Amino acid sequence: MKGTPSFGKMNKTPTHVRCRRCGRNSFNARKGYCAACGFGRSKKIRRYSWQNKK
Amino acid sequence: MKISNVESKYSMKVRGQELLIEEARNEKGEKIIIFQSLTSAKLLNNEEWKENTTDAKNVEKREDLPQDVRKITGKILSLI
Amino acid sequence: KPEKENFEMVINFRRVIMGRKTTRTKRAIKYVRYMVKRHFGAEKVIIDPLLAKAITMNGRDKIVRRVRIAVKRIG
Amino acid sequence: RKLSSPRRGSAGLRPRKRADEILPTPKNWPLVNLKEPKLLGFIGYKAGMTHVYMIDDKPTSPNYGKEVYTPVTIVESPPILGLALRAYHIDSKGELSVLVDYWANFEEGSLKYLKRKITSLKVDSSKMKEKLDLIQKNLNNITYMRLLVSTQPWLVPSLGKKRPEIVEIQIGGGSIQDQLNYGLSLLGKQIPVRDVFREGQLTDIIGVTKGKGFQGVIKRYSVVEFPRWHKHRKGSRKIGARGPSISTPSYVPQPGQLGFHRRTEYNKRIIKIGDNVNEINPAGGIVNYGLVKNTYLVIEGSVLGSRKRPLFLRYPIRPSWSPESAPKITYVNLASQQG
RNA sequence: AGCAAACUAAGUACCGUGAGGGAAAGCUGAAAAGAACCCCGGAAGGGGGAGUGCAAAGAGCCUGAAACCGGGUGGUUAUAC
RNA sequence: GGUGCAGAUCCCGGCGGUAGUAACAGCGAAGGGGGGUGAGAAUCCCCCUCGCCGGAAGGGCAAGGGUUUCCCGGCAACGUUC
RNA sequence: GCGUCUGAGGGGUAACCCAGGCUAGGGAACUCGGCAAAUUAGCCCCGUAACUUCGGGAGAAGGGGUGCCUAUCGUGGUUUAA
RNA sequence: GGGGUUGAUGGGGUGGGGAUGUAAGCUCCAAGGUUGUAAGACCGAGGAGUUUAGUCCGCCACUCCCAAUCAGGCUCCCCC
To answer: Whose CA is closest to D87, among D30, D142, D151?
Structure first.
C-alpha cells in the first residue's frame, strides 16, 4: 500500500550497481547504461556545465 | 498438634531421582505421611547441610511399601 | 533457644484466592514463606519442590484449599 | 427540546464526606412532651434482620386487625454503664458550652474497660464535692442536662472489641431539680433498655451507613447510561457536559466516596423487647454476626448501616402517629439466613 | 567567521534506487615531570592520602557567563498578592 | 568600517518546566521450585516439573545484508529492565 | 521449538476504559436506520410456492430422525484369491 | 475500627448450619455375548444397595494447639 508496504518489495537487486568507472553504485543494468560514470553510450566522460551550483 | 517421634523411613528410586519417605504420628496419634526428596540445601550462614540417610532402608519393588502408604502415593507420584 | 520442632502445621489458602486469577500460584508459595517465618522464626525458607508442587497440579489458577506441612527447621 | 427533568443526584446533602467518629451523635432533641424524668434514646448494635408476622396496630391501617408479613431488624441491647454528668449553661457571650463535668467511678466501677481507652481519674483528687455543689450553686441557671454513658461490648462476643465508646444523651422530664437527682441516681450502676424504652414506642436513628469505597457516578447519583450506541462508543459511564461554562462548574454528579455517611431516619416503631435468645436466634448462627446473648430490640423496616456498627437511638422528632404498645406477633423465622 | 574544509578521513560519515544534498568537531605546561608509593572498591586518569611542578580547573586538561541545580551565608513565611 | 539587537512562528548551541508524569498492557505463552557461577541475579547457567505453539513460533531452500558463523575474554554504552 | 513476540513485583482488585460471559419481565417502546447483538446452522430422509429467459428460483418454504452400549446383517475392496 | 498473654484477633481441631446431588471400591442385577461338556467364570453401556453420601462452604460457637514477639522511632517531666 502507498504507505510503508510500498517500501516492502524493496529487497530485489539495485537498479543501479557498481559501474566499473566512477566507483558509484549507479550502473542501471536495466537500461544497459550508467547514469553516473557515463560508460555505455558516450565514449567521452559524462560531464556537465552544472555539476553543482555555480 | 505436635509430632512426637519417627518410626518409619525407607528409600525409593523413581524417574532417575532419589526419594525418601518418612512416617510418624502426632501427639493426637494420627498417622500422617511425610514426603521429602532433597539431600542438599544451602545453609544460611554459611555452609552446606548434608541430609543424613544412613538408617534408611532401601525399597526396590512397589508392593514392598506398606499397603496404606502405597495406596496414597498414587495421587502424588505422577507429578514428581 | 528456639524450639527446634519436628512440627506439622496446617495452612488455609483462603486469602490468596478470590482476587487475581493470574497470580495465585506465585502468591501461593509466596504466602508459604509468610506463616513459616511467623510461626517458626524462619530466616530463610527452603521448600522441597514436591510439597510445593502439589499446590499446582493445576498450572495457573486452581489450588487446593489446604495442605499439610512438615518442617525440619535447622538453625 | 429540553424536556422537563428533575435534577439527578441529590443536591441536598452536599458536601458528601466520611464521618470522623464511628459513633455519631444527635444535634437536636425532640421536646420532652409533658412528663417525668427519663432518657430519650438508647445505644445498641446492628446484629441482623428477618421477617415477622403480626396483627396490625395502626387503627387507620388498611391492613388493620390482620396478619401481614414484614421484614424486621434485630438490635442486641447490651447494658449501658454511665460515666458522669455534664453541666451546660448560658455562659459568657451567651453560649451553651460545658459548664462543668461530674465524674464518679472511684466510688464504684473498679473496671479497667474504661482504662483501655482513657487514662481516667485517679483517687488522688476525687474531690468532686466542689464540682458537684457548683451545679447546686449554679442551679436554676442551667438549660440542658445530658449524660455520660459507655457501652459494654465486652458482654457481647459478637463484636471482638474491648475498649468501649463513651457517648452522650440529653435528658428531659419534670423540674430541673428533679432531673439532676434522677440522673444522680443513674450514676455508677447499670441501666437496661427497659429502663428507658417500652414496646410499641417510636424511635429515631442516627448512624453510619454501609460504607462502599470510592464509587462510580453511575452508582453514586444514579446517573443514566447513555443510550445504545455509547454501549459501543467512546465511553459510557460518565456525564457528557459538566456545566454551561466555568460559571460555577457546579453541584453536578461527580465521582467520590459513597457510604459510611452520617445519615438520618424517621418513624421507626419497635416490635419486641424479648429476653430469650432462643426465641430469635436463627439457624446455624446468625450470618456474619454470631449468637445474640443479651436483650435485643426487634425493629421492623430497614436500619441504615453495616453489620457490627454501634447505633444510637432517639425518641421521635416528628412522629407521624402516636403508637400504643405491643404489636403482638405470630411467627419468628429461625431458618438459616444461608440457603 | 573565514571558501565546506585549520581536527586521525574531509566531498569523508551519512540521506536518497537517482541525478544529487550534505555535515560536526582546534588549545595539558616548556620540558608528561601523566601522580611512584600507602588505604577503599572488582574496575573505572575512580575515592583518600602523599609527590611533580610557578601554577594544577591533571586527560572531560587555558581562561571558564548565563540560563540550572545543590550546600551554605543574611534576612524572611502558613490571613493571606 | 561586515559595526552597537528582544524579538524576525530568526539561526545555532546549552538547559528549563509540564516531571520520574506518559509509556515499558491490548495482536489469546507462563512459569515455579532446588542448586551454580560471579561483587552484584526475577532476568545468566544446571536439574526437575509445568504451559504454549505445533500446514507453523517446525523443517529446507533465494535476491540482501557481509562476518550477521564459530572459538576465547569481557560489560561504559549499545539491549525498551537488569 | 519456545517460557526474548523481552521490564517487573504488591493488593479483598475503587471508579473507569478495552476485550468478554450472563441477566428476571416486556420484547424495536431506543433508534434517521434492528446499528450492534442475538436466533438458526453439520448431516440424512421426507417435503418444497408465485414467477420465469423453462435453464432455475431451490439449503425456496416446512417436518422428522441424529447419543451410549450389547448385538447383528448387508455391500464392496484387499491378500498368488471368478 | 478493633485485638494484642490480664487473649477468642486470625489459622488448626470439634461441632453447628449450608451448596451440589449420592464418592471410590465391593456386591447384586444387567439388553446379550464370550467361553466353558456341564457346573461355573468372563465382557458389558447401565440400575440398586453399600450412602441425605463424598467433596466443598470469603458463615457461627467452644476449644489457648500455633501465631500477635523480637525491634525501631518520636517525645514529657510546665505543676509541686
So the answer is: D142
The DSSP secondary structure of D126-161, one letter per residue, reads --HHHHHHHHHHTTTSEEEE--EEE--GGG-TTS--
Of D51, D64, D49, D54, nearest to D329 by C-alpha is D54
CA atoms of D30 and D17, how far apart (whole Å): 26
Cα pseudo-dihedral D107, D112, D114, D120, rounded to 10: 60
Neighbouring-strand partners of residue C66 = C12
Measured in angstroms, the CA of B35 and the nearest CA of chain C are apart by 7
Which protein residue lies nearest to nucleotide G15, measured between its Cα and the C1' atom? D216
Question: What was the elucidation method?
Answer: cryo-EM
Q: Are D56 and D65 in contact (CB under 8 A)?
A: yes
Contact of D32 with D41, CB cutoff 8 Å: no
**Which are the contacts of D214, defined by CB distance < 8 A and separation ≥ 6?**
D255, D256, D257
From the list C7, C43, C49, which residue is nearest B44 (CB)? C43
Closest by Cβ to B3, choosing from C6, C44, C54: C6
Vertex D318: Cα angle to D314 and D319 (nearest 5): 80
Question: B-C interface: how many C-beta pairs under 8 angstroms?
Answer: 42
Place of cell 463484636: D159
Instruction: State this model's resolution in angstroms.
Output: 4.9
The reply to whether A22 sits in an annotated binding site is yes
Q: Which long-range contacts (CB under 8 A, 24 or more apart) does C36-40 make?
A: C36/C71, C39/C9, C40/C2, C40/C5, C40/C7, C40/C71, C40/C73
Residues D45 and D279: their CA atoms lie apart, in Å, by 18
> Looking at D25-106, which runs of residues are DSSP E strands?
38-39, 43-55, 67-76, 80-89, 98-103
Q: What is the C-alpha separation between D100 and D102, in angstroms, rounded?
A: 7
DSSP state of A37: S
Q: Which three cell numbers stand for residue D236?
A: 459510557
Q: Do C70 and B49 touch (CB under 8 A)?
A: no
From residue D246, alpha-carbon distances to D240, D241, D242, D250 in Å are: 15, 12, 9, 9
Q: How far is CA D42 from CA D150, D173, D277, in A?
A: 11, 16, 20
Query: D226: which DSSP letter?
Result: P
Inter-CA distances, A48 with A32, A34, A38, A54, D284, Å: 21, 15, 11, 12, 105
Q: How far apart are CA D105 and CA D57, in angstroms?
A: 44
Residues of C whose CB is below 8 A from B1:
8
Strand nucleotide closest to residue D219 (CA to C1'): G15
Nearest CA in chain C to B5: C6
Q: Rounded to an integer, what distance in angstroms lies between the CA atom of residue D276 and that of residue D303?
A: 23
Strand partners of residue D29: none
